[PDB]
Amino acid sequence: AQYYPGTSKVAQNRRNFCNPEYELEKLREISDEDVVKILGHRAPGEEYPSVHPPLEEMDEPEDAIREMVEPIDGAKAGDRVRYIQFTDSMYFAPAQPYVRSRAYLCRYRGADAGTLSGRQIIETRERDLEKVSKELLETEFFDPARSGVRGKSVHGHSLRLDEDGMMFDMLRRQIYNKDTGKVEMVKNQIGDELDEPVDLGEPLDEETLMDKTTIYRVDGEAYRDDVEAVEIMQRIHVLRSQGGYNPE
Amino acid sequence: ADKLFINALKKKFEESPEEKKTTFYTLGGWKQSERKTEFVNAGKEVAEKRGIPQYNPDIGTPLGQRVLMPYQVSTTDTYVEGDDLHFVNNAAMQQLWDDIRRTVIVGLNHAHAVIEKRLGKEVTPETITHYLETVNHAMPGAAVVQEHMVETHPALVADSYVKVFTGNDEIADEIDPAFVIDINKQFPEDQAETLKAEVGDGIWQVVRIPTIVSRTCDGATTSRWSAMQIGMSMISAYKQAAGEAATGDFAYAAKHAEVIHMGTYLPVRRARGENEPGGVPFGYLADICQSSRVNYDDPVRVSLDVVATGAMLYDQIWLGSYMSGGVGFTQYATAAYTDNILDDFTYFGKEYVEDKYGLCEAPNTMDTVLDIATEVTFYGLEQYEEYPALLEDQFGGSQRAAVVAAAAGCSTAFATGNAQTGLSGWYLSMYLHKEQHSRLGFYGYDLQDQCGASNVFSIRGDEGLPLELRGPNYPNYAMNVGHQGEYAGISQAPHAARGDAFVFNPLVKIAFADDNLVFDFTNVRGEFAKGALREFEPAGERALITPA
Amino acid sequence: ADKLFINALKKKFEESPEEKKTTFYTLGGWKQSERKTEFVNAGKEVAEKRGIPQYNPDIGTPLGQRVLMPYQVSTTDTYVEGDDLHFVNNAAMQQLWDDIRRTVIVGLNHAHAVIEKRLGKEVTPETITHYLETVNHAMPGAAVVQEHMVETHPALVADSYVKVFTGNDEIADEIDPAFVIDINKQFPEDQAETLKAEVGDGIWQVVRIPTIVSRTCDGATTSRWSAMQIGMSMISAYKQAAGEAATGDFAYAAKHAEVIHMGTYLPVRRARGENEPGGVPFGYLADICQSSRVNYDDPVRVSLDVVATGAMLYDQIWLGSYMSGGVGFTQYATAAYTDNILDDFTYFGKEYVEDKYGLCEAPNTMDTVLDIATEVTFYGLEQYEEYPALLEDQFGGSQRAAVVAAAAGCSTAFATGNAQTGLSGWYLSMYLHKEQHSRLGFYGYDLQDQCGASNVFSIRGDEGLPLELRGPNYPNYAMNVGHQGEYAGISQAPHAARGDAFVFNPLVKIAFADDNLVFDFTNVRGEFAKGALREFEPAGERALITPA
Amino acid sequence: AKFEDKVDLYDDRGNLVEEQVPLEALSPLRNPAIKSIVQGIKRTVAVNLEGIENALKTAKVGGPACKIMGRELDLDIVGNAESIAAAAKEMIQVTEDDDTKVELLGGGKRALVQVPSARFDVAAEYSAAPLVTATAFVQAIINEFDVSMYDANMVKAAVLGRYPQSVEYMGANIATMLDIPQKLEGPGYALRNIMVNHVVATTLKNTLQAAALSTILEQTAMFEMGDAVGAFERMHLLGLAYQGMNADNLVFDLVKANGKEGTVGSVIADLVERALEDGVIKVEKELTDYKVYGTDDLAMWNAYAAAGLMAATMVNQGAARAAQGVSSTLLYYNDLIEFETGLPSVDFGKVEGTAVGFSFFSHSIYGGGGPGIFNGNHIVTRHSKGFAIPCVAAAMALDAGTQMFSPEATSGLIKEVFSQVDEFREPLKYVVEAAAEIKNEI
Amino acid sequence: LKTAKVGGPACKIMGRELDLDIVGNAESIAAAAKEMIQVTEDDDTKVELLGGGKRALVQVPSARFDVAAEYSAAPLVTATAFVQAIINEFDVSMYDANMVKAAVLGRYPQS
Numbered sequence A: 001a002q003y004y005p006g007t008s009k010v011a012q013n014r015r016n017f018c019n020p021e022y023e024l025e026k027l028r029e030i031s032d033e034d035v036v037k038i039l040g041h042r043a044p045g046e047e048y049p050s051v052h053p054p055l056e057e058m059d060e061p062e063d064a065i066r067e068m069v070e071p072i073d074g075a076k077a078g079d080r081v082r083y084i085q086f087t088d089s090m091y092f093a094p095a096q097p098y099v100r101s102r103a104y105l106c107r108y109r110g111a112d113a114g115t116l117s118g119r120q121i122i123e124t125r126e127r128d129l130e131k132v133s134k135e136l137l138e139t140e141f142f143d144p145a146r147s148g149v150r151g152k153s154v155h156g157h158s159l160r161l162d163e164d165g166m167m168f169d170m171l172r173r174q175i176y177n178k179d180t181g182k183v184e185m186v187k188n189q190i191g192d193e194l195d196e197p198v199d200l201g202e203p204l205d206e207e208t209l210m211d212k213t214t215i216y217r218v219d220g221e222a223y224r225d226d227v228e229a230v231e232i233m234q235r236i237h238v239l240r241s242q243g244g245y246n247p248e
Numbered sequence B, C: 001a002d003k004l005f006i007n008a009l010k011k012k013f014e015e016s017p018e019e020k021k022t023t024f025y026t027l028g029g030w031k032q033s034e035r036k037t038e039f040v041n042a043g044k045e046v047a048e049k050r051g052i053p054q055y056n057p058d059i060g061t062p063l064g065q066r067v068l069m070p071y072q073v074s075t076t077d078t079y080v081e082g083d084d085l086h087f088v089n090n091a092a093m094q095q096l097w098d099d100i101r102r103t104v105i106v107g108l109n110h111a112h113a114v115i116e117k118r119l120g121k122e123v124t125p126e127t128i129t130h131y132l133e134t135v136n137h138a139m140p141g142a143a144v145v146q147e148h149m150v151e152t153h154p155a156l157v158a159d160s161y162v163k164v165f166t167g168n169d170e171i172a173d174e175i176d177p178a179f180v181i182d183i184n185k186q187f188p189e190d191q192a193e194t195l196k197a198e199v200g201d202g203i204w205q206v207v208r209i210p211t212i213v214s215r216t217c218d219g220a221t222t223s224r225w226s227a228m229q230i231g232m233s234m235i236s237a238y239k240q241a242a243g244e245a246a247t248g249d250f251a252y253a254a255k256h257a258e259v260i261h262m263g264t265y266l267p268v269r270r271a272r273g274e275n276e277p278g279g280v281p282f283g284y285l286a287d288i289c290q291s292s293r294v295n296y297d298d299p300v301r302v303s304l305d306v307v308a309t310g311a312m313l314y315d316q317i318w319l320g321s322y323m324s325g326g327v328g329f330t331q332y333a334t335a336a337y338t339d340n341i342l343d344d345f346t347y348f349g350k351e352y353v354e355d356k357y358g359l360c361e362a363p364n365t366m367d368t369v370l371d372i373a374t375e376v377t378f379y380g381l382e383q384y385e386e387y388p389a390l391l392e393d394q395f396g397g398s399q400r401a402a403v404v405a406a407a408a409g410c411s412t413a414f415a416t417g418n419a420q421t422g423l424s425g426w427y428l429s430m431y432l433h434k435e436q437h438s439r440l441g442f443y444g445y446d447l448q449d450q451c452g453a454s455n456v457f458s459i460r461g462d463e464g465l466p467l468e469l470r471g472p473n474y475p476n477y478a479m480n481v482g483h484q485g486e487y488a489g490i491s492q493a494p495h496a497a498r499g500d501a502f503v504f505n506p507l508v509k510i511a512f513a514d515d516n517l518v519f520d521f522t523n524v525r526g527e528f529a530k531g532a533l534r535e536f537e538p539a540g541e542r543a544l545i546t547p548a
Numbered sequence D: 001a002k003f004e005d006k007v008d009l010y011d012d013r014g015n016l017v018e019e020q021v022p023l024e025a026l027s028p029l030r031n032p033a034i035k036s037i038v039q040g041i042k043r044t045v046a047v048n049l050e051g052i053e054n055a056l057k058t059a060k061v062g063g064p065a066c067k068i069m070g071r072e073l074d075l076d077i078v079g080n081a082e083s084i085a086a087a088a089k090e091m092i093q094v095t096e097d098d099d100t101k102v103e104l105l106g107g108g109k110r111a112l113v114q115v116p117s118a119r120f121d122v123a124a125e126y127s128a129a130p131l132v133t134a135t136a137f138v139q140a141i142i143n144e145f146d147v148s149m150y151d152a153n154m155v156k157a158a159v160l161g162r163y164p165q166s167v168e169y170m171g172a173n174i175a176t177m178l179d180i181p182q183k184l185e186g187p188g189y190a191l192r193n194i195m196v197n198h199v200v201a202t203t204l205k206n207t208l209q210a211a212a213l214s215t216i217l218e219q220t221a222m223f224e225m226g227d228a229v230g231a232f233e234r235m236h237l238l239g240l241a242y243q244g245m246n247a248d249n250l251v252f253d254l255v256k257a258n259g260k261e262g263t264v265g266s267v268i269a270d271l272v273e274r275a276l277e278d279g280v281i282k283v284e285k286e287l288t289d290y291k292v293y294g295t296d297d298l299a300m301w302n303a304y305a306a307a308g309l310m311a312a313t314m315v316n317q318g319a320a321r322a323a324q325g326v327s328s329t330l331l332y333y334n335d336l337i338e339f340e341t342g343l344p345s346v347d348f349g350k351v352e353g354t355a356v357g358f359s360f361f362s363h364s365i366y367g368g369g370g371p372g373i374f375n376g377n378h379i380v381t382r383h384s385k386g387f388a389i390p391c392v393a394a395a396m397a398l399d400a401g402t403q404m405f406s407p408e409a410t411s412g413l414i415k416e417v418f419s420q421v422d423e424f425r426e427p428l429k430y431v432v433e434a435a436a437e438i439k440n441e442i
Numbered sequence E: 001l002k003t004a005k006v007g008g009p010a011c012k013i014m015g016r017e018l019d020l021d022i023v024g025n026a027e028s029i030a031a032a033a034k035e036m037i038q039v040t041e042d043d044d045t046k047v048e049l050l051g052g053g054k055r056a057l058v059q060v061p062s063a064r065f066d067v068a069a070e071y072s073a074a075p076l077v078t079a080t081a082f083v084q085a086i087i088n089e090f091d092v093s094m095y096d097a098n099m100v101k102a103a104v105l106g107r108y109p110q111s
């Protein structure tokens, strides 16, 4: 699969995020317990809640499609469908909203992805969400200054940065410590205080952000200069126009 | 010269507009804001008086961790907090809608034929004047035939009246001028002659029913109220039986055969009668706006006055209340009429067009669309990139999508002189924007834009329509903010560039060229500023009949 | 004792009420009237200011060749000229309608099930109270989640709020009482127990959106506005993602699955959305009126308070403006709530029933209809014959037809305990009246009455319906004055006689049992009098945002 | 034949049933099983006799939370259902032994009714089905118990609700798959105003049958709307065949290959490879490390893409056994496939657009709901001309119980009655056999 | 089309005028429309010119209503067949074809 046209670094990074064969760079270690804390759907050690019985106990009808499509493990167990949501700064966060949704439906099974300008969300079965979330938090999908885990009050993608390079957060879930150079997650994604904060590590430096980003900007790589990517967008516009008029 | 939004950005923020860093969290929350402070105190007074909690800043999340911005109303020097541009808080905005809702256009051509051909009586400018004196007594709710009638208080209904217009200059001049919309006085020479030739010897009434009635009732009341009092005035002025078979011909004429509603009725899921915002097609909205007849040497100004009219009506009142409600959609709309931002982008596009093609001289083709819409989209997005303060101002992706695509679409239509290629340019802008920033609008913003390219030139039943005929009930457009008012602008754009007197209905254009309206449709953005400042005096208030 | 209308007749005329002769033509024309004099002066001022003639007494025919009468508002000692009972001139009447239009009832039962079964969270009296504090901040138009929101001015929207009720007394007492409609306090014991048993463990919101919004917009806005702010408050109070899949279940529940509109939408010829008067069935109108819970030892008073409510809303505002307009239909309606006339006739009929059958003890049969409706019709018509002043008071045949038949229909229903036989009595009354005086109403008055007898007991598709379920959109009833409000009274009559807590919907009955309404639904006629005197203070005014 | 295209037809287990069938043999205009299904759905009514009885005995008539005290009537309708049904049938039929049916279910608690076809021959539309059924049952109930003239109007209210004060049959105890003509978003829309949950319930949550029934209804509506006339006809026929009838086993084989470990993206890759293998698309030119694909047959590319879209929904929502993500699949299948190829997505962007709005209105405060309450007449999901809603039906068929407004909640009366009808429940074999029957008439 | 008076009473879009000799080519337009309206050749479709080509009588084939819920297929199938026939008769451009649609079916679906 080729995923996306273009010859910029931005275009290559977009392809890399989409490509399940591309092994995402691990930038930080976050324990399974701290993923569960950040998510805020259940307490550590709490058995998974259930929205319905395990598939073995709710007797699905005979169906070739069901027989051919393997349920994800959380579906087998009847897990709730829960979410994780990120906001990405337009100041060179590595991932960006359509990049995430496109990538999620190439890389992850059983995924409900939604794109908005100031928030991007995935909803899936709870135990699977936990595994996906570990990857979303530990790898270059995430930077703790230019990205934020936010289930509400998402304002910030388009705001100026603060003096530490941190994106705005109305609820200040992620706190930069000048004395350590690290970001601490002090609240879960919905904004409730953690009894024990989670170390998110150091923010990426500015040159590395520019190297890894998937946003086009005049002060980075501009979309208008990635002429092959622009060509394909214009082509799609024209062919959609033609098809709607007369597809013969 | 400076970009047109630079003054506003300098007024809003401490930092210069190019600066990428600022300060948060230490601004005092809501206490930074005069208006929020007013609201906190009012909420306490409300709760105390009624015994139920109401507005309370401590509910939910805490506003004002960032700067709560003032907005410049574009083309003005007025800066206000956004709450003053909420339609609930802005009497000018409410009166704009009331003045549309309470208006209907009703012909006298069938009526005069009934009088001459069925009753066998003459119609002359003198009989017309007598009829108009009669109907200006009757229309606000007063009697002309029966004994022991009880009537509306004239001071409560002072905004209701009837005028006429005709393309026949000699007839027009023979009718008492108190009752005539003077096309020659209200329109510049070229526009006046266009409009008179469209109307010809036809004679048309512009009827405005009382604001207090329109507010008590609904839009579908207007043509009925109009017809009842036209009917009574025909009986009184032409001396027929007060209720004979011919009376029914006047009713059918006034209610159906020669009525022009501002809006057509809506389907059941969004059920509404006539003269509601969803029924008003984009070309009528452009013609209601009167910028065309005063700013006719500046097509950008004309087009963006239409955008202001439509963004407010369609996003704030229609989508933000009729179709939803609550806090609503103030800033989805203000993005299109504040801080001179859309103005900057559209004047850029107009100059690009004048330099490359000449106004209305570009081929009406997809090649022109690809050229202009791409260039203008890239200019607009570059401004958000160059000026972090601009991006923080128009903080929602939907706002930016609408503003950039409006400039792109209007500019394309300036070049082609055709609204349909303008529309194609709007959709191309969205697609480019989405790829440039890997985001566009809110969750559901681009339903119509994704369907958009394919439906621009479609001819199928519920797909194909010239843009001027489309409106808020065009299926793809029926749900979402940040499009409808901008489409009214794109509808206006080629006609403004061509110098056309109207976009879609010349009777609608003439019908709002009337200094006896309450809202000033020649300067919509000026009026929004006046209302924001609490300086606008609406019709329809009940002070006269309530305690002092 | 004297007939109940005698005081009013003595106040209106110089002659004794039984005298057959009077004086005309020398009374001073309009100058006899304080109110007409006010109007003449106001018309001159209006015309001078705006440059267009307006109210002018010398247009058409000359009012006041006979006495221009005062009217006693029934059950009061207030006498006013009829103009003061025109809905345009009466803020109480306008606010009655606004308080209905801006109300919706919305369950929390599906909502709580989404929280418990889909989200897996607890619902308790404490979470409900926290939700209610939240929604009472949000509902008038204020924010709970997003940054940089702009909001409605709390003082402009002070009339908007949310309360709840439930049949479970133990749950009701654990919710903060500021937010609870207390069924045990508002209703007498037996009615309270009936109502609580209907509701059971259900929990229902009564949502009232702002009058200023309802007036700017329409009735179909109400359930949407309600649902948006319910949705936001569910997000904030139960701490979920601010927009996840489950959010759509709260939307569907609040907008569709557990909403009760006051009115259902109307078909195209009279196109309107929800919560407009034509959609309000007669049984809901009887339940909105709150006379039942205060005047429960007097079934005549309860029934005729419902008649007043409906005559005003359905004839003056709905038929007289929404469906027509102009001078309108003030006196077609006032006939049913002034001068204690309908009261005299209906108390006569109630006594006849009590003496002959006992309330609710007559056979539910045509023989009972023939007996009671005939006797009461003849009594009413005899009063017009014996008192020429009465006949000159209710000068229009339609007025008399409606009043006499309302007394006949209500009386029949008092006897049978069944509204359908009451309705048959109404139609028989019309037929008898027509033969007695060789006249009935205006040209089109008895369309529904001629169809009436045959459609009372019909079971066919668009014919058959219990009266309680009928309303202004029942086909035969869709056009004409002097019926709809009276039918709401007949709907009420058997239930008042039976002591039933409600007529058709117990949730509607409870929803208006609320001291925080603006209009006092327990004393509709008292409120009409207060508005006539210009002593009623409505919601929705713009004074705070306009020049002083 | 107007078109030269031929398709191979399969059963819902992926077995070949008919080879090289002319495309037009699947047309709603030609295929007699589609005709039978559509006529059947027009004329079938579910009658809730238990619901009528309970409404009468409580006087709860005329809509939610409504009751008229003093009007109660205690009638043993269910106990006398055989006699009532036979009396109703005598009134509903035109002639003895015509195609009228009145069949009791649930021990007399429900009845399946099929109003005779002859009544619709001389009708403008379809409302004769509920209206003839309603009055026949009102009259039969009155006659069974000698209900008085004074009380009969309560039987009417219990059967048909608040109509005509309400425009709809508000509080009725009868139900149809179709809704009243006034509720159409546009003329021609009536077969689109059928709730997804009704289709899923009727087909007993069999995924391929739900997709087939939905596609039949949607694409048949496209003919009634005029959308499948002239230049667009072949596009709609190929969509019907490849997206809803598993033509050439393409949907089935994509699901087979991607069901164990696959994603929306992996289905896309396989579909593009198949389109290239079959000559539907080819490389038009090369950019830098990027192949730009073209096609000389937009309608066939669209149909292949539509098959992949259905398979992608089955793989993605099937893996979750949760329907909500269908809005996401409908969006990003199309978004991804455009940037993968340089060709337009399904319905030239209209599925993606529908998906944007549908995502919004199934995850927001403003309206909509869960996937099951949508339909082709819904303002959110009317925009694509038949290519979106069948995927929603497939996704809801695969849902294991994540929805509050499930078919069990919204569609129980419809399920009980309409799933009895073989051609409604299992339409695919009937349409395939009918195609075989007429193949030589095309 | 020649006046750009489309979309309802007193409506006009200046600059959109298209001067097409429809009546002069009515036979060809009618025959092309008939090919699209029919289901099969020699079924009960009719397209018959009246008034020297100024009007046409159309009967949409019964088979289309056999698989329709109601009756709106008649105007909708007729409308699109004539829109397409007119476009093809004169090689109306993609850019202008929407005016032909407006001239045939009016302001629908905004109205």
Ligand code: F43
Pocket (backbone or CB within 6 Å): A116, A117, A118, A119, A151, A152, A153, A154, A155, A156, A157, A158, B325, B326, B327, B328, B329, B330, B331, B332, B333, B395, B396, B397, B398, B399, B440, B441, B442, B443, C142, C143, C144, C145, C146, C147, C149, C150, C228, C229, C232, C235, C242, C243, D363, D364, D365, D366
């Ligand atoms: C709860 C939702 C989901 C939904 O259905 N509607 C919401 C909320 C709703 C509420 C918020 C009021 C409140 O705070 O109580 C209101 C005002 C509508 C109402 N009920 O009156 C609204 N949005 Ni929203 N909504 C907006 C917007 C947006 C932008 C904000 C992005 C950002 O970075 O700040 C995003 C979508 C996106 O990412 O593109 C958005 C999301 C959302 N919007 C998320 C909440 C986001 C959060 O948790 O912070 N809106 C905008 O982009 C600007 C206009 C603004 C609207 C108010 C106005 O027009 O003045 C408001 C319009």
Ligand SMILES: C[C@@H](OP(=O)(O)O)[C@H](NC(=O)CCCCCCS)C(=O)O
Pocket (backbone or CB within 6 Å): B269, B270, B319, B320, B323, B324, B444, B478, B479, B480, B481, C224, C255, D361, D366, D367, D368, D369, D379, D380
């Ligand atoms: C979708 C539909 O809602 P339902 O699904 O019918 O509840 C429709 N609302 C809307 O379109 C809301 C539009 C305004 C709010 C969102 C603006 S982006 C309506 O209420 O008729």
Ligand SMILES: O=S(=O)(O)CCS
Pocket (backbone or CB within 6 Å): A116, B442, B443, B444, C243, D360, D363, D364, D365
């Ligand atoms: O977040 S959502 O896109 O659902 C609503 C934007 S107001």
Ligand SMILES: O=S(=O)(O)CCS
Pocket (backbone or CB within 6 Å): B243, C442, C443, C444
């Ligand atoms: O005279 S008519 O009966 O037509 C109207 C009475 S208001």
Ligand SMILES: [Ca+2]
Pocket (backbone or CB within 6 Å): B009, B010, B011, B012, B013, B014, B015
């Ligand atoms: Ca500054």
Ligand SMILES: [Ca+2]
Pocket (backbone or CB within 6 Å): B056, B057, B058, B059, B060, B061, B062, B063, C143, C144
């Ligand atoms: Ca707060």
Ligand SMILES: [Ca+2]
Pocket (backbone or CB within 6 Å): B169, B172, B173, B184
């Ligand atoms: Ca002159």
Ligand SMILES: [Ca+2]
Pocket (backbone or CB within 6 Å): B184, B189, B192, B193
């Ligand atoms: Ca001149």
Ligand SMILES: [Ca+2]
Pocket (backbone or CB within 6 Å): C009, C010, C011, C012, C013, C014, C015
């Ligand atoms: Ca006296």
Ligand SMILES: [Ca+2]
Pocket (backbone or CB within 6 Å): B143, B144, C056, C057, C058, C059, C060, C061, C062, C063
């Ligand atoms: Ca006079």
Ligand SMILES: [Ca+2]
Pocket (backbone or CB within 6 Å): C167, C168, C169
């Ligand atoms: Ca108790």
Ligand SMILES: [Ca+2]
Pocket (backbone or CB within 6 Å): C169, C173, C184
């Ligand atoms: Ca208590």
Ligand SMILES: [Ca+2]
Pocket (backbone or CB within 6 Å): C184, C189, C192, C193
């Ligand atoms: Ca008690």
Ligand SMILES: [Ca+2]
Pocket (backbone or CB within 6 Å): D436
């Ligand atoms: Ca065979």
Ligand SMILES: [K+]
Pocket (backbone or CB within 6 Å): A048, A049, A050, A052, A053, A054, A077, A078, A079
């Ligand atoms: K489990």
Ligand SMILES: [K+]
Pocket (backbone or CB within 6 Å): B167, B168, B169, B196
């Ligand atoms: K002249």
